[PDB]
Amino acid sequence: NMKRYMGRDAQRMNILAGRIIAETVRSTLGPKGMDKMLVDDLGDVVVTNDGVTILREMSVEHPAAKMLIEVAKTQEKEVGDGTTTAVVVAGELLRKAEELLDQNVHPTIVVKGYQAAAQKAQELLKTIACEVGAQDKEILTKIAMTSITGKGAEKAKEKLAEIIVEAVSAVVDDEGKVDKDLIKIEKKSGASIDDTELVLVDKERVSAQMPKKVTDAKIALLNCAIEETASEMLKDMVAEIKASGANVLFCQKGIDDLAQHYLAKEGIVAARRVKKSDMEKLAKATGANVITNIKDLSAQDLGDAGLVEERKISGDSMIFVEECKHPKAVTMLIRGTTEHVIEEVARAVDDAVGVVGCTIEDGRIVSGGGSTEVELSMKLREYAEGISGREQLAVRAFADALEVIPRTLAENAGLDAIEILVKVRAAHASNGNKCAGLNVFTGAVEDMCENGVVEPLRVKTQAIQSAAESTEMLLRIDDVIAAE
Amino acid sequence: NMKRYMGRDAQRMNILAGRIIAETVRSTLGPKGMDKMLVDDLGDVVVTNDGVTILREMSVEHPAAKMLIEVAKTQEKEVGDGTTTAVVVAGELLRKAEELLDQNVHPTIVVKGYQAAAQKAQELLKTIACEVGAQDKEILTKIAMTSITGKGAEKAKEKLAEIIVEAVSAVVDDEGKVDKDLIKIEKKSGASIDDTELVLVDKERVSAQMPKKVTDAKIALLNCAIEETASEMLKDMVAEIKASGANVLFCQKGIDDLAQHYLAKEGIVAARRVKKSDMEKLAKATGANVITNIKDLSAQDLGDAGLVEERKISGDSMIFVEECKHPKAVTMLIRGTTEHVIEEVARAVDDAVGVVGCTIEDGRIVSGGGSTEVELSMKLREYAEGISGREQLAVRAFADALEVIPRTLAENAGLDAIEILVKVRAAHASNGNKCAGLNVFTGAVEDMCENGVVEPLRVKTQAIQSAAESTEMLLRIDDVIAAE
Ligand SMILES: Nc1ncnc2c1ncn2[C@@H]1O[C@H](COP(=O)(O)OP(=O)(O)OP(O)(O)=S)[C@@H](O)[C@H]1O
Ligand SMILES: Nc1ncnc2c1ncn2[C@@H]1O[C@H](COP(=O)(O)OP(=O)(O)OP(O)(O)=S)[C@@H](O)[C@H]1O
C-alpha cells in the first residue's frame, strides 16, 4: 500500500516525468518561439509564451513533475526573465544523467561532478560578464531593448526603451539599490501603444462637497466602518482622523451620510467601499497601514503619495493616486487599444524594469542568443580534463548539457541544429569571440555585443543554480511512496 | 521479388548485422580473454581464441555479415596478429555512425569525416611509433616475447624468444627484406615444449639399396609415373633424370620395380606415392617445379635443400628435407607432448616470426595494451577542433570510437571499464606518456615501454585502414536486393 517503484523503475519514472514537461515549454524559447493555449475545467481561455505561467495554471498531477515547477516559480520571484531557460536546462541535465546511469556509474559520483561543475560555472561567468556603469544610459537602453525583444519585435520600438531607462534611474535611493515597488503601473485604454507617457482606484468621492486634488497628501487607510444614527455620533470619528492629520481617507467599508458632511466640512476627502484588492495596493504603494479601529489611528500609519486627482480618464471618473517631481516614485501610464493588449504591454514593462534595475545594482551583463552558453561549455570541458576519477564524466555531461539552449534556438528558428552547433563552437576556441552567438533573423553567426542582444548576469547565474540544485536532489531518489 | 528493405530499414539491418558478429569476438581480446568452441554439421570439435579462425569456419548466412569477414581475412593475410582488433573497431564505427544517422546527419558528411580522420590517423601513428634498429636483438627479443604473450603467459618463457630472433636475423637476404617461406616448420612429438631446438615427408626410400643423406642435394619433383613391363624400358627414364643432375627424386605416382634397381645403380634416391599436399610443400620450400613429363625434366626445375636425411625420429622413419649452415634457410623442430599441443606451439611461432620479420623490414613498433589507442584518440579530437562544418562530428565519432579497445581490455580483465578510461586519458594530456597503458595483471596504469608490451606498427595501421574502408562502404548502402 499503495504505490511503489523499485530502484531502476523509480529512477527512470522520475527522470521521464521531468523531461516530459520540459518538452512542453521547449518550443516557446527564442524570438521565433511558439505560444501555448491552455483550456482548464472552467473553459477559460488564455494564450501565453511565458514558461512559468503555463506550468502553474495547467493540470499537473505527477509527483516528480510538481517538484520542477518550483524552479521557474523561484525564477520569476528572483529574476523574472529566463523562466523558460531554467526548465529546459534541468531537462537536459536529466537526459545526460540517465546515459551515465545505464553504464553503472553511481549516482553519488554523478552528484559529485554536477556540483563541482556548477561551482566552477558560477566562477567562470564572472569573467565573461561585462561591466555596465550604473548610469551608462546608451547601454541601459540596449538592455531594456533586449528585454522588450523576445516578447515581440513590433513591441521593440526605439522610443519605448528610452522612456523606461529614465524612470528606473530616478527611483534609485542613493546609495544605491533599486526598489521595483516605487514604480506605479496604471492600466488604461485609448488608442495608444505609442501614447504611453512617462494605485488607480475605480471609485469617486463620497461627497460632491469635497475637493479634488492635493499636493503632498497624507492618506489614512481605514478598514473599520465610520458609521451611525441621527445624533451626530461621527463628530468624534471625523476628529480622530483629523487628529492624525490625513487629508485623504480610503475606507474599505461604508461611510455614513452624517460623517460625509463633517469630513467635507473639515476638507478631508473620503471614498466608500473600495475593493479589498485595491486597499492592499494602496498600503504598499504609498507606505500606509490598514487600520481596523478608528480610535487607534496614528499619524505614522499614513501613506505618502505625490498627486491624488479624480480625473475623468477614458470617460470614467477614477481616483489617480500617483505622482511626484524630483521623484523617488514614478507612475507609468501603460495604455493600449483593448484591455488584453494593455495587460500584455504591462507585463512587457515588468521585465524591462527588472533588467535595468539589476544592471544598476550589479554592473553586470552577458551576451544573449545562446552566446555565453557556448563559452561556458568549452571552458568546463577543459576544466573536466584536470579532474581525475569517474566524476570527470559527470562534469563532461554537465558541460555537454549546456549546449541545449543554442541547439533549441536553432530548432525553433528553422535552421539546422547540427550545423550551427559546430560553427559557433569553432568560433569560440583560443580567444575570440566570447560574444559570438546565433542571430535568428540573419541566419549566420554574428557578434552579439554589436547586435544589441544582451541580458543581465542574474538571468544566467540564477537559472543554472536553480536547475543544478533541483537535478542534484532528483538524482538522490531511489524509492517513491505515493499513497491514495 | 524477393527481399528488400527500404532506406531506414536497410541501413539499420546492415549495421546490426555487423555489430552482432563483432560482439561474438569481443570477449576474446586481451591476455585475460575468452575462448570459443565451434560445433558444425559434422560434429567436429575445435576450440580457438584467434578471431579469424572463428569467423571463417562457423555458419554465417547474413549478406552484411559476410562482408565483414573480409577484414580479418585480409588481416591474417597481410599481418597475422591483430585479427580480433580489426573487427571490434569496425563494430564501434557502426555504433557511432547510427548515432549520427538518427540525428539526420547525412551519410556522405559522415563518410567525408571518417575518411579524413583515417587519413590523419595514419599520419599521426608515424610519430608515436618507435624505431627499432633491425639487429637490436634485445628489443627484438621483447617484440617476440610480446607476440608469444597473448596466446599464453606459460607459453612465454625467456629461452623461447631468444631462439626465434636468431632464426629470423639469419634468413634476411641482404639487403634487406625478410622471406617467411625460408623458415621451415616441423611438427614432431616427444616430451618437449622445452626441447624445441633451433618439409617432413611421411615416407621412406623406395629401395634399401639407395643411400640415406646427401650434402647440397638437387631435388627433382616428378608428377608423372616412372613405370614398366619386363624389358628394361626405364633405363631411358632413369638416365633422363640423371641428365638433369638430381640425386634426390620425389615422385607423386608409383615407381616401378625395374626403375628402382637402376636409380639405386646410379646413386639416385627415390620415394613412391608421396601425398599431393607434401608435393606442393616441397616445390615451394626448396624452390622446385612439379614436372608432369619425364622427357622435359630440366636442371633449372630442381629445388635446393641443405640436408636430406631419413631419420627414425619418434620411431617412424621419415625423410628430413631441411637444413643449412651459414644459412639462408632455417628449420624449426617444433615439438610437444600431444599433436594438438604441437599444432598450437606451431601457430604461436607463426605470429612470432611475423613481428620480428616486420621489425627488420620497417624499423617500427608501437606500445600495446591499449596504449597508442588513447594517444591517437586525443590527437584526433584536437584535430577535429580545426575542422568547420558537420563533418567535424564524424571525426569526433571516429576519435571516440578509438577508445573501444582500451575499454574492452578492462571488460575482460575484471576492472571497471569506466574508471580506467579516465585514468589513462588524463595521463596522456600535454606531453607524457604516449606509452601509458593498462596492465591487466597489475591492475594500475603502467608505462608499456618499460613493461615489454610492444607491437609492430603494421598491427595498428592495417587494422585501422581495413576497418575504415569497410565501414565507409557499408554506410553507402540504402537498398538491399537478396533473391532466393
Ligand atoms: N535578437 C536576438 N538574437 C538572438 N538571441 C536573442 C535575441 N533577443 C533575445 N535573445 C535570446 O533569447 C533568449 C530569451 O528568449 P525568451 O523566449 O524570451 O525566453 P526567456 O527569456 O528564457 O524566458 P521568458 O522571457 O521569461 S519567457 C535569451 O537567451 C536571449 O539572450
Ligand atoms: N602484457 C600485456 N599487457 C597489456 N596489453 C597487452 C599485453 N600483451 C599484449 N597486450 C595487448 O593485447 C592485444 C592483443 O590481444 P590478443 O587477444 O592476442 O588479440 P590480437 O593480437 O588483436 O589478435 P589475435 O592474436 O590475432 S587473435 C594487443 O592490443 C596488445 O598490445
Side-chain angles (χ1 to χ4, degrees), chain A residues 1-227 229-484, chain B residues 1-227 229-484:
Chain A
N1 50 311
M2 281 168 180
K3 286 180 180 180
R4 198 186 76 173
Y5 305 98
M6 282 288 287
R8 298 159 189 170
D9 295 328
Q11 289 169 29
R12 197 168 69 256
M13 196 70 180
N14 288 9
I15 290 164
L16 198 144
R19 282 183 64 189
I20 199 160
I21 54 165
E23 282 192 35
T24 319
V25 289
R26 213 163 84 109
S27 60
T28 60
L29 208 151
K32 286 190 277 181
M34 313 280 89
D35 283 47
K36 305 291 165 178
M37 192 182 73
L38 282 62
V39 182
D40 62 312
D41 47 294
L42 291 160
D44 296 342
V45 62
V46 63
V47 184
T48 179
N49 194 291
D50 188 31
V52 70
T53 50
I54 305 161
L55 295 158
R56 284 201 294 105
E57 290 182 46
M58 76 181 185
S59 299
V60 183
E61 289 298 314
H62 199 284
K66 287 180 78 69
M67 283 186 283
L68 207 70
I69 314 164
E70 295 281 67
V71 182
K73 201 176 282 180
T74 51
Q75 186 71 41
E76 65 164 342
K77 196 79 178 290
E78 297 294 320
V79 185
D81 188 47
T83 53
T84 307
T85 56
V87 180
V88 179
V89 169
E92 192 70 23
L93 291 166
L94 289 161
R95 194 189 76 91
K96 288 282 180 180
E98 69 166 314
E99 287 178 2
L100 297 160
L101 289 167
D102 285 35
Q103 288 184 34
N104 290 315
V105 176
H106 201 271
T108 55
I109 313 295
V110 182
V111 83
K112 200 176 186 290
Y114 267 55
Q115 194 204 51
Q119 198 172 211
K120 189 68 180 181
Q122 289 294 315
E123 66 176 55
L124 276 170
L125 280 156
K126 289 178 178 69
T127 33
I128 65 167
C130 298
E131 308 292 323
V132 164
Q135 281 183 112
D136 208 315
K137 291 180 180 180
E138 63 160 311
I139 305 167
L140 290 162
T141 307
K142 292 175 182 179
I143 298 153
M145 197 91 278
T146 312
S147 189
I148 308 159
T149 317
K151 294 183 185 292
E154 74 290 325
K155 295 175 183 177
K157 197 182 179 181
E158 261 282 312
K159 295 186 82 179
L160 190 72
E162 293 180 328
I163 294 162
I164 303 158
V165 177
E166 199 175 317
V168 187
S169 299
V171 294
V172 177
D173 48 294
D174 300 314
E175 288 176 39
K177 296 282 180 180
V178 183
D179 186 39
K180 282 87 180 180
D181 293 325
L182 289 168
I183 305 162
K184 282 107 192 184
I185 300 156
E186 243 52 57
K187 292 185 283 291
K188 267 322 130 166
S189 69
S192 181
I193 292 160
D194 294 22
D195 295 8
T196 52
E197 55 185 319
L198 174 69
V199 188
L200 213 85
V201 175
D202 193 46
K203 226 220 98 70
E204 294 177 42
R205 56 194 197 188
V206 75
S207 184
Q209 192 186 313
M210 288 156 187
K212 215 178 284 289
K213 172 184 74 181
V214 231
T215 313
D216 313 313
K218 299 93 181 180
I219 313 164
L221 267 72
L222 281 177
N223 194 16
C224 186
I226 323 155
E227 279 175 313
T229 47
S231 185
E232 56 176 47
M233 294 177 181
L234 295 49
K235 288 185 79 180
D236 295 2
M237 286 184 178
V238 174
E240 279 164 36
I241 302 160
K242 198 196 181 70
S244 61
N247 49 10
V248 179
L249 183 76
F250 274 102
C251 186
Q252 196 175 316
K253 292 284 176 69
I255 316 160
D256 206 288
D257 198 25
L258 290 161
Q260 294 177 34
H261 168 266
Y262 299 126
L263 281 158
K265 206 178 182 180
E266 308 273 32
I268 309 159
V269 186
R272 54 167 153 87
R273 296 197 176 273
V274 176
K275 285 281 181 290
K276 198 179 180 180
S277 59
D278 300 334
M279 285 291 288
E280 293 176 324
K281 289 275 185 174
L282 286 155
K284 294 188 82 69
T286 59
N289 296 326
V290 185
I291 312 298
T292 330
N293 191 37
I294 205 154
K295 290 282 283 291
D296 212 353
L297 184 68
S298 185
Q300 280 73 46
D301 295 334
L302 321 175
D304 192 54
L307 205 144
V308 179
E309 187 181 14
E310 194 186 313
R311 294 178 184 178
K312 287 187 176 182
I313 212 80
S314 182
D316 299 321
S317 54
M318 289 163 291
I319 311 159
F320 271 70
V321 186
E322 82 222 292
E323 199 37 40
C324 274
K325 197 281 200 208
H326 175 77
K328 291 284 178 181
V330 173
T331 299
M332 290 293 288
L333 195 66
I334 295 161
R335 302 179 77 187
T337 52
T338 53
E339 195 64 42
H340 278 108
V341 169
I342 304 161
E343 199 182 358
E344 191 81 323
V345 185
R347 280 189 282 263
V349 174
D350 283 315
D351 292 44
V353 167
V355 287
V356 180
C358 284
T359 310
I360 295 162
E361 284 189 40
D362 301 321
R364 283 216 257 216
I365 56 154
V366 279
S367 53
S371 178
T372 43
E373 287 87 299
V374 188
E375 178 67 32
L376 194 73
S377 184
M378 72 156 205
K379 282 282 179 180
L380 279 164
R381 275 190 289 268
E382 60 184 50
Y383 167 73
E385 290 179 42
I387 305 164
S388 59
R390 211 178 299 179
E391 56 184 317
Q392 176 209 238
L393 299 161
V395 182
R396 286 187 180 270
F398 197 93
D400 288 10
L402 291 163
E403 289 181 8
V404 71
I405 308 298
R407 193 170 61 89
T408 47
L409 275 157
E411 280 181 36
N412 295 317
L415 294 87
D416 187 50
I418 324 159
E419 185 64 41
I420 311 166
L421 199 71
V422 184
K423 279 184 167 68
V424 188
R425 200 189 297 173
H428 267 259
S430 69
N431 266 38
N433 291 351
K434 186 203 282 182
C435 196
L438 176 67
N439 196 13
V440 294
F441 305 97
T442 314
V445 54
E446 288 183 320
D447 202 299
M448 294 282 93
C449 282
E450 295 162 43
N451 284 27
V453 187
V454 282
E455 358 183 76
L457 183 63
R458 204 193 288 182
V459 183
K460 293 292 173 191
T461 49
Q462 171 76 41
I464 291 163
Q465 199 64 231
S466 59
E469 285 182 34
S470 61
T471 47
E472 281 185 50
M473 194 184 286
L474 283 163
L475 284 163
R476 286 167 73 93
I477 312 160
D478 59 305
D479 197 292
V480 183
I481 308 157
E484 191 191 49
Chain B
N1 50 311
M2 281 168 180
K3 286 180 180 180
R4 198 186 76 173
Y5 305 98
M6 282 288 287
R8 298 159 189 170
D9 295 328
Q11 289 169 29
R12 197 168 69 256
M13 196 70 180
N14 289 9
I15 290 164
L16 198 144
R19 282 183 64 189
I20 199 160
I21 54 165
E23 282 192 35
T24 319
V25 289
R26 213 163 84 109
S27 60
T28 60
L29 208 151
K32 286 190 277 181
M34 313 280 89
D35 283 47
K36 305 291 165 178
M37 192 182 73
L38 282 62
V39 182
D40 62 312
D41 47 294
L42 291 160
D44 296 342
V45 62
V46 63
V47 184
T48 179
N49 194 291
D50 188 31
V52 70
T53 50
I54 305 161
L55 295 158
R56 284 201 294 105
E57 290 182 46
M58 76 181 185
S59 299
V60 183
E61 289 298 314
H62 199 284
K66 287 180 78 69
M67 283 186 283
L68 207 70
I69 314 164
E70 295 281 67
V71 182
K73 201 176 282 180
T74 51
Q75 186 71 41
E76 65 164 342
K77 196 79 178 290
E78 297 294 320
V79 185
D81 188 47
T83 53
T84 307
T85 56
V87 180
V88 179
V89 169
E92 192 70 23
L93 291 166
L94 289 161
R95 194 189 76 91
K96 288 282 180 180
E98 69 166 314
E99 287 178 2
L100 297 160
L101 289 167
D102 285 35
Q103 288 184 34
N104 290 315
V105 176
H106 201 271
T108 55
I109 313 295
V110 182
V111 83
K112 200 176 186 290
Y114 267 55
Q115 194 204 51
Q119 198 172 211
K120 189 68 180 181
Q122 289 294 315
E123 66 176 55
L124 276 170
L125 280 156
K126 289 178 178 69
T127 33
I128 65 167
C130 298
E131 308 292 323
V132 164
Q135 281 183 112
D136 208 315
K137 291 180 180 180
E138 63 160 311
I139 305 167
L140 290 162
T141 307
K142 292 175 182 179
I143 298 153
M145 197 91 278
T146 312
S147 189
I148 308 159
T149 317
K151 294 183 185 292
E154 74 290 325
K155 295 175 183 177
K157 197 182 179 181
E158 261 282 312
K159 295 186 82 179
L160 190 72
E162 293 180 328
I163 294 162
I164 303 158
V165 177
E166 199 175 317
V168 187
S169 299
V171 294
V172 177
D173 48 294
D174 300 314
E175 288 176 39
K177 296 282 180 180
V178 183
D179 186 39
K180 282 87 180 180
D181 293 325
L182 289 168
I183 305 162
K184 282 107 192 184
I185 300 156
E186 243 52 57
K187 292 185 283 291
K188 267 322 130 166
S189 69
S192 181
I193 292 160
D194 294 22
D195 295 8
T196 52
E197 55 185 319
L198 174 69
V199 188
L200 213 85
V201 175
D202 193 46
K203 226 220 98 70
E204 294 177 42
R205 56 194 197 188
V206 75
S207 184
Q209 192 186 313
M210 288 156 187
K212 215 178 284 289
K213 172 184 74 181
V214 231
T215 313
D216 313 313
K218 299 93 181 180
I219 313 164
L221 267 72
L222 281 177
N223 194 16
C224 186
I226 323 155
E227 279 175 313
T229 47
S231 185
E232 56 176 47
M233 294 177 181
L234 295 49
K235 288 185 79 180
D236 295 2
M237 286 184 178
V238 174
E240 279 164 36
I241 302 160
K242 198 196 181 70
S244 61
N247 49 10
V248 179
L249 183 76
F250 274 102
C251 186
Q252 196 175 316
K253 292 284 176 69
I255 316 160
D256 206 288
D257 198 25
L258 290 161
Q260 294 177 34
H261 168 266
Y262 299 126
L263 281 158
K265 206 178 182 180
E266 308 273 32
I268 309 159
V269 186
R272 54 167 153 87
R273 296 197 176 273
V274 176
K275 285 281 181 290
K276 198 179 180 180
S277 59
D278 300 334
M279 285 291 288
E280 293 176 324
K281 289 275 185 174
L282 286 155
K284 294 188 82 69
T286 59
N289 296 326
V290 185
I291 312 298
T292 330
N293 191 37
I294 205 154
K295 290 282 283 291
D296 211 353
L297 184 68
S298 185
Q300 280 73 46
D301 295 334
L302 321 175
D304 192 54
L307 205 144
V308 179
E309 187 181 14
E310 194 186 313
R311 294 178 184 178
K312 287 187 176 182
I313 212 80
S314 182
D316 299 321
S317 54
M318 289 163 291
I319 311 159
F320 271 70
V321 186
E322 82 222 292
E323 199 37 40
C324 274
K325 197 281 200 208
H326 175 77
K328 291 284 178 181
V330 173
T331 299
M332 290 293 288
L333 195 66
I334 295 161
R335 302 179 77 187
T337 52
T338 53
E339 195 64 42
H340 278 108
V341 169
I342 304 161
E343 199 182 358
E344 191 81 323
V345 185
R347 280 189 282 263
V349 174
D350 283 315
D351 292 44
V353 167
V355 287
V356 180
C358 284
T359 310
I360 295 162
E361 284 189 40
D362 301 321
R364 283 216 257 216
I365 56 154
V366 279
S367 53
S371 178
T372 43
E373 287 87 299
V374 188
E375 178 67 32
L376 194 73
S377 184
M378 72 156 205
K379 282 282 179 180
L380 279 164
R381 275 190 289 268
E382 60 184 50
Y383 167 73
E385 290 179 42
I387 305 164
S388 59
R390 211 178 299 179
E391 56 184 317
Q392 176 209 238
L393 299 161
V395 182
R396 286 187 180 270
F398 197 93
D400 288 10
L402 291 163
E403 289 181 8
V404 71
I405 308 298
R407 193 170 61 89
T408 47
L409 275 157
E411 280 181 36
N412 295 317
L415 294 87
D416 187 50
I418 324 159
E419 185 64 41
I420 311 166
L421 199 71
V422 184
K423 279 184 167 68
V424 188
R425 200 189 297 173
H428 267 259
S430 69
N431 266 38
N433 291 351
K434 186 203 282 182
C435 196
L438 176 67
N439 196 13
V440 294
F441 305 97
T442 314
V445 54
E446 288 183 320
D447 202 299
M448 294 282 93
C449 282
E450 295 162 43
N451 284 27
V453 187
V454 282
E455 358 183 76
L457 183 63
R458 204 193 288 182
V459 183
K460 293 292 173 191
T461 49
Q462 171 76 41
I464 291 163
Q465 199 64 231
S466 59
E469 285 182 34
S470 61
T471 47
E472 281 185 50
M473 194 184 286
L474 283 163
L475 284 163
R476 286 167 73 93
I477 312 160
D478 59 305
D479 197 292
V480 183
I481 308 157
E484 191 191 49

